RNA sequence: CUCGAUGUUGGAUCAGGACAUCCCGAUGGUGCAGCCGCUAUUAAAGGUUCGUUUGUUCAACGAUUAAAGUCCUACGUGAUCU
RNA sequence: CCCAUAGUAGGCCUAAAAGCAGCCACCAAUUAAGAAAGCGUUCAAGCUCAACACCCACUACCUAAAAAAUCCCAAACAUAUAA
């Protein structure tokens, strides 16, 4: 968890909104900062790592 | 070092009380009074 | 030694002991059966 | 009672057993119907840690327990007196019942702190470092709880947590 | 005979009556002998006067 | 039995065993007796030879160990428990082994 | 507040709290112990 | 919710043993109480400060005589909680007008008619 | 000589085609649409059914309240089945299937804009409802084993209890009341108002009488 | 802060007969 | 609680403390031969790098190091600065 | 704590199943010991438990811990008649 990047006023300099997921077996990295809450950030990071790693098991 | 969450005697946690020794004579004592107040109220 | 809130004896050398205020397994037959009391 | 001698003449030992004198109960107890020594005498909640005249007419020569099939009292006295006397030797109250040493062994000196109704042994107690609030003090305990039943003749009962 | 066999306290026997009794007429004489020689200087009393 | 197989009996060089069954001061002398004649502290050491001797001539209780460095072992069981001689039997034992290696 | 029922054990109200105390079971004390008699 | 009580009809059944505990003759009942407010009103319901109010009760250990009777009795049974409870005894019987100025009502629950603020002679 | 007894007998004794415990599933056949409110009473006071055994001879006693979800129904099933001996035991449901509607808001929704969807099902239990009974040729050392260690895992306070244990149990609790030295008894005072003390109790403690304390159960309470 | 949903009850409201 | 004002990221400076210890110390267990590790107990005295990109906290990467610890301090500190 | 021989490696299945992968039976020698309760072996060995003997082990069969950031926190006390 980390906080986002933009021009957001005062929110993102204390609220780490942003979720950066790492896969340890696949080394995929996916980051989300769209949204302000960092759980609809981490469900949609989670999401994409989901059709990423969809893939993935699909080269697999 | 030990501190109650919000105010002491309010709220999902608070600070634990006790009864002492004396506060259950007390209650006893009343407890007598009020039993014998049933006999004399039955005649 | 392993930390532990429930004490067993893994085996029949296992044997209790309270030393230092606390309960203690010992077994020189396995010492992984060693045990601490938390 | 029975004693173990070891002599060794001409390099051959010799190991034999012989019977000293055994003391005897004192005549017609008080109460012969008790099952225990220490309710046939009354002496049931009337002991405590210091009265060593009785406590050491159940402890070894170098302060060890004697069994309880020996001296036949009953389990709820037999851990009474056993924790009288560990207060006690923590007190100094049992000089002559000293550990045995090895030869050769000499101990050390060691600070000289007089204590009194120690219930625990003091090399494994821990500080108080946080004594805690008052809701949840952490208190010192003082005396041994299998002695809460002793007759009281204050009104406060003994405070077992200091 | 242990720490706990007799109280801490000793035992007090207290006189009995009927010595007493006269042990105590005795005494009283006597303070009354002092009243009637004037055997006393300035007296102090204690009153209950307004609660 | 199993305490006094671990130890062996290889620096003993003959235990003699010698009671009076008829008397009331022998149950010592015969439980240890029956501790080592037992075939686990016999197998040991077949080099020890284990001899009972029956006597009716009211002595008390003896027992005489020889080891292999001469020197003899004698305890007598009248007033000794049989835990207390295989103790020290045992010590006896775990020096004589000591001395000749 | 907190509701009637709780996870938690909910701290209970003074009075209530010495009621509970005061009606504690106190089971029978013999004058003598049965194990001292034979 | 709190709401008013209803006390069983049991709770006021006297048992033999109540009687020798208390020395009540339940065949011959005391004809009047003797109430004493020993109890707060405050953080106690309204209807416990109306009862208070009409049985006397304003001032507490205030001892205030009342009729053994049902209707009474049922007053007191809303607020047996905050008094106390007994029986008046008549050693030399109901006071007559020439002794009205010399009564006193002693902590035992005895009514005497004569006060002579004299130690006995016997 | 070492005195030998005589042992009991389960010749007697016979075990059902399907020993094992039946699948639970999370939902019922038809999901609810009527959500429902959160009604705490349902686990609070004593139970008033499932309270004595039907079949079998052992079964885990709830010694207070909670509610049980499909986790805890998996755990019981899988524990007993691993550990049950199919040729001499047979084990039944004695709680039914999750059917109380539990309702979850979005995470992270403020306060506000009506009731939660529906997201799981959980069976109310109260204190002295019997979960699990088994029964058939075995002793309760044997099942006593694996019963404890499931009645652990429990949301709320169990023990393994026997036809025996249990009236034993409540036997010994009949005793406790009636030996009672105490003068004071919560039922007495509370019944009776003495001390005003209904303003600080339940109505419901006229009849719980101090034995439970919102979905506790206190056995040394009398 | 996220935009919550609404409640689909309506009506309900009427006071009581006496 | 504060809108008749309690000044926001990150950095600089100075750091105070917690131990749920990254390094150094003392120990138990091992599928611990040794060399390296894994895990647990104990220990907060001491230490915990320099850089490219990015406003960055992070992260990636380069070169190292016994180690480049996790957190709290009004997301420590703007009447010290940026 | 002490102690353990044997019909027999029961049959069947199985490359092998020998008390201890499954299935059936679960009888019997010896005063005493389950066609085996827990380990183990590729299968066997091997180590225990339930046996006998010895003998008053003459057992409790109710339970369980801890960590935060300025500096622990009244001082103390088990003994003289419950007020
Ligand atoms: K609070
Ligand atoms: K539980
Ligand atoms: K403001
Ligand atoms: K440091
Ligand atoms: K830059
Ligand atoms: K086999
Ligand atoms: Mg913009
Ligand atoms: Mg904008
Ligand atoms: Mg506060
Ligand atoms: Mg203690
Ligand atoms: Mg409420
Ligand atoms: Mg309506
Ligand atoms: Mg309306
Ligand atoms: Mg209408
Ligand atoms: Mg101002
Ligand atoms: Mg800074
Ligand atoms: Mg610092
Ligand atoms: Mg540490
Ligand atoms: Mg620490
Ligand atoms: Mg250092
Ligand atoms: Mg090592
Ligand atoms: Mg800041
Ligand atoms: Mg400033
Ligand atoms: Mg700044
Ligand atoms: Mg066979
Ligand atoms: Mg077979
Ligand atoms: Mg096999
Ligand atoms: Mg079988
Ligand atoms: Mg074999
Ligand atoms: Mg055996
Ligand atoms: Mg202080
Ligand atoms: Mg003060
Ligand atoms: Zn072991």
Redesign the interface.
């Known amino acids: 968890t980390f906080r986002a990047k933009g021009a957001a006023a005062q929110h993102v300099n204390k609220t780490d909104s942003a979720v950066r997921l790492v896969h340890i077996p696949t080394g995929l990295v996916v980051e989300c900062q769209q949204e302000?809450?960092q759980?609809?950030n981490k469900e949609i990071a989670f999401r994409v790592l989901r059709a990423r790693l969809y893939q993935q098991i699909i080269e697999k | 070092r030990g501190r109650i969450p919000g105010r002491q005697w309010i709220g999902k946690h608070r600070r634990p009380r006790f009864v002492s020794l004396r506060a259950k004579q007390n209650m006893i004592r009343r407890l007598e009074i009020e039993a014998e107040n049933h006999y004399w109220l039955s005649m | 030694f392993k930390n532990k809130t429930v004490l067993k004896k893994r085996c029949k050398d296992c044997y209790l002991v309270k030393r230092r205020g606390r309960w203690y397994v010992y077994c020189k037959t396995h010492p992984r059966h060693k045990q601490r009391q938390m | 009672f029975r004693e173990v001698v070891e002599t060794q003449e001409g390099k051959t030992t010799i190991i034999e057993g012989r019977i000293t004198a055994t003391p005897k109960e004192s005549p017609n107890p008080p109460n012969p119907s008790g099952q225990c020594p220490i309710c046939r005498w009354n002496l049931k909640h009337k002991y405590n840690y210091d009265d060593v005249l009785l406590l050491s007419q159940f402890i070894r020569p170098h302060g060890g327990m004697l069994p309880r099939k020996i001296t036949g009292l009953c389990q709820e006295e037999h851990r009474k007196i056993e924790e009288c006397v560990k207060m006690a030797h923590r007190a100094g109250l049992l000089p002559n019942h000293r550990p045995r040493l090895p030869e050769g062994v000499v101990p050390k000196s060691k600070p000289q702190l007089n204590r009194y109704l120690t219930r625990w042994a003091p090399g494994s107690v821990k500080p108080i470092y946080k004594k805690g609030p008052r809701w949840n003090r952490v208190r010192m305990p003082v005396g041994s709880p299998l002695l809460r039943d002793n007759v009281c003749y204050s009104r406060t009962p003994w405070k077992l947590y200091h | 005979k242990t720490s706990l066999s007799s109280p801490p306290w000793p035992e007090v026997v207290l006189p009995d009556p009927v010595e007493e009794t006269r042990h105590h007429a005795e005494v009283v004489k006597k303070v009354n002998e002092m009243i009637v020689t004037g055997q006393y200087g300035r007296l102090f009393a204690v009153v209950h006067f307004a609660s | 039995a199993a305490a006094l197989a671990r130890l062996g009996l290889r620096p003993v060089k003959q235990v003699r065993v010698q009671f009076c069954p008829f008397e009331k001061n022998v149950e010592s002398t015969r439980t240890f007796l029956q501790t080592v004649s037992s075939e686990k502290v016999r197998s040991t050491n077949l080099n020890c030879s284990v001899i009972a001797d029956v006597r009716h001539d009211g002595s008390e209780p003896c027992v005489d160990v020889l080891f292999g460095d001469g020197h003899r072992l004698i305890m007598r069981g009248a007033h000794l428990t049989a835990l207390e001689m295989l103790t020290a039997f045992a010590s006896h034992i775990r020096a004589r082994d000591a001395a000749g290696s | 507040g907190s509701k009637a029922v709780t996870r938690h054990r909910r701290v209970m109200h003074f009075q209530r709290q010495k009621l509970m105390a005061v009606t504690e079971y106190i089971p029978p004390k013999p004058a003598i112990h049965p194990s001292c008699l034979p | 919710k709190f709401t008013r009580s209803r006390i069983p009809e049991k709770v006021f059944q006297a048992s033999p043993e109540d009687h020798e505990k208390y020395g009540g003759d339940p065949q011959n009942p005391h004809k009047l109480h003797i109430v004493t407010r020993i109890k707060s009103t405050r953080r106690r319901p309204y209807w416990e400060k109306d009862i208070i109010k009409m049985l006397g009760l304003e001032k507490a250990h205030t001892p205030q005589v009342h009729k053994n009777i049902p209707s009474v009795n049922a007053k007191l049974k809303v607020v047996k909680h905050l008094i106390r409870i007994k029986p008046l005894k008549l050693p030399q019987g109901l006071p007559a007008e020439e002794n009205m100025s010399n009564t006193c009502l002693k902590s035992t629950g005895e009514l005497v008619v004569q006060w002579h603020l004299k130690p006995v002679e016997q | 000589v070492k005195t030998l007894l005589p042992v009991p007998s389960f010749e007697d004794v016979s075990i059902p085609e399907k020993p094992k415990l039946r699948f639970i599933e999370r939902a019922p056949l038809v999901p609810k649409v009527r959500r429902e409110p959160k009604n705490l009473s349902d686990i609070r006071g004593p139970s008033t059914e499932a309270t004595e055994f039907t079949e079998g001879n052992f079964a885990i006693l709830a010694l207070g309240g909670g509610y049980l979800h499909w986790g805890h129904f998996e755990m019981m099933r899988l524990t007993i089945n691993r550990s049950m001996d199919p040729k001499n035991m047979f084990a039944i449901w004695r709680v039914p299937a999750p059917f109380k509607p539990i309702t979850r808001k979005s995470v992270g929704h403020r306060m506000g804009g009506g009731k939660g969807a529906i997201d799981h099902y959980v069976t109310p239990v109260k204190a002295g409802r019997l979960v699990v009974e088994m029964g058939g040729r075995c002793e309760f050392e044997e099942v006593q084993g694996f019963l404890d260690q499931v009645a652990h895992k429990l949301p709320f306070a169990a023990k393994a209890v026997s036809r025996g244990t249990l009236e034993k149990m409540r036997k010994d609790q009949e005793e406790r009341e009636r030996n009672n030295q105490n003068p004071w008894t919560f039922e007495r005072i509370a019944t009776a108002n003495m001390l005003g003390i209904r303003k600080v109790l339940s109505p419901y403690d006229l009849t719980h009488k101090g034995k439970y304390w919102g979905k506790f159960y206190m056995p040394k309470r009398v | 802060k996220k935009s919550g949903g609404s409640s689909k009850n309506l009506g309900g409201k009427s006071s009581g007969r006496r």
């Open positions: 302000r809450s759980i609809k």
